[PDB]
Amino acid sequence: NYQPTPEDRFTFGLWTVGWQGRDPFGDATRPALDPVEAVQRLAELGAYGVTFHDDDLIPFGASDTEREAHVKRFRQALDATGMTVPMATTNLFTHPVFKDGAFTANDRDVRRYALRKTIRNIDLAVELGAKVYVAWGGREGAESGAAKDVRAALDRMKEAFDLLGEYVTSQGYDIRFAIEPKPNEPRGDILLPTIGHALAFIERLERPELYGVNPEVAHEQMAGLNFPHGIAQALWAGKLFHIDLNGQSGIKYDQDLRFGAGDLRAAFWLVDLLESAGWEGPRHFDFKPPRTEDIDGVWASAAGCMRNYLILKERAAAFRADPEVQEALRAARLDQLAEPTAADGLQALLADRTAYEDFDVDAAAARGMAFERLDQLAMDHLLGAR
Template structure:
């Protein structure tokens, strides 16, 4: 059965095409900065938003038109697998991501959940083997079920902690079965509402303890994907322990997890933390911790995680600048953790939205490559810090100066001349790169 009978495989037709079911900028075989677009971008599709999101919101019932619902939950789960791989093949996307509860119903017990997951992942593996599509990462949903009301690894209940461990173990078994390249921890409820009854140190120790158990089990079964922590400042927890990249890095360094964990960064999570996405990417990159990204954008007029498809070219350009500076994103990728808007309820919108996101990142890649080729930002920075190329600056950088020697130098200074950054002109020139004028 085909779920999108009127849509052919999406191909590149160039920026002048009028065909909405074609790529305008994403040409997977086009070489940019020494690699093909496909190698640079490593696109992935998120199972949860694509297959499970129904278009409902706090003020309205589901509106999305979907044709894969069956007579039972398991029949629906199998139909979703068929439809999902049809989407992946038609988009020519190489990777996908999922939470355990996305693909299989939980049932009435852990044993039943395991059986359901095994049955569905058998089907997924058949599809992967037939298509060559790969698992970018999987994770365990340890935030939706009522048992995780007070957290999973940070819970105050030892039995809940054990249940969370069982989900992670199964998640790693699935990762091995499907050849997952990464494994993500998103601590949706690893945080607190009030410190009145919270032992923060105790909870953080337990989170780290769980992470170390995961590393040990991965080594035991001979399958150790790249482990990733995904920061988010709030929602659903009021105060989440993985607030942003810097907070998560502090946690990684405190507990000695540097060799095993990097970060999976999301654009909308960055803005919720009061940062730009490029800030979060830079913090991770300069600490050798940029592992993978979730591609989306938020609405600056709304104060929650809207997970819109990325269409802001300015943002994707700076994202790709960071990924190029990082030397690439592999074994991570660019996963579209994004959902169609409530008004985009048709089946075809699932493909149209991904086409828009893929084209925006492809265009951003090309602009970023031109900026790097012209050394636009490098020259700006070199000029701004030029004084450190002087004898004084070189002595400072070589640790040849101390407070006394610098004081003696400062006493001889008659006038310090500062240089304007001309930031408005710089932004105007950047616009020319984005619009193709340069």
């Protein structure tokens, strides 16, 4: 069972299943993958659609004639299979010109170029019907201190995004932006390192309602952070416009393991949160089938992403629906957490003797939280041992 279907809204980037397997210490182990192939092979697995960077669909340096040809092939493949394109993004990290950044490159010409390159693909995104546009500034950062004044770099970043919002507004476009944070790699330190930082930045943009976050499992885990907590904060602020699902095993280089791999329990809690919140965005995977795999392994790995999600979905549902679990929830006063602290006004609080003078701290401290029993119920469910 656990067979995924387009109704599950699973999506993959063409750069994922399309990863040739090139790493810092080794060359490609797989041949390039024709976007049409990736479209057809994914639809067959039950995927809902695909996402792409501009350079994944249209080769860099392509002519206006060649560009039109590449999109036609991709279009015909999307129409025949019924696959959609919910999200689009720009590649502002691969080319040598972006070695010092894109929107925050010290050189002004590079920055202007970055914007124009992004704008052209935003138009293409709209045509393909993409409603979300991700921006991952992997080259926005530094390796040394004096090399980048962060404040000036942030001003440039705000200016870049404001211009981007102004553009979609003047064109009457129906597309929002999703900023994807990353603590490091490819840069020593990357600006807007976590979901928290991206969220904060968005608040100082001219039109904030147009920007959200595109958190990625591996990225936040590269800072040893709790992913579902991060995501919880993004939902709390209504800023979760898109998400990247994968696996990461600890603080180290981005491994982009298939969703489910890496921190299993963190993947379980994530699914729990997304389902319980009713999040409606596509479940997009940004992973890289290990370079040890051949083309058949790539498809196995991609199928694994969706499978693990559905498995966790089921287990998380059973956990929350379990009468004994719900009972354990009340025992850990999770219900009181959802109750306002002082809906009786600040004045009533200051006069409430039960809130200070008559509060029996010792009695309160002696009461166990009962989290461990609760957690083992979650473990039994995850492992199917109940």
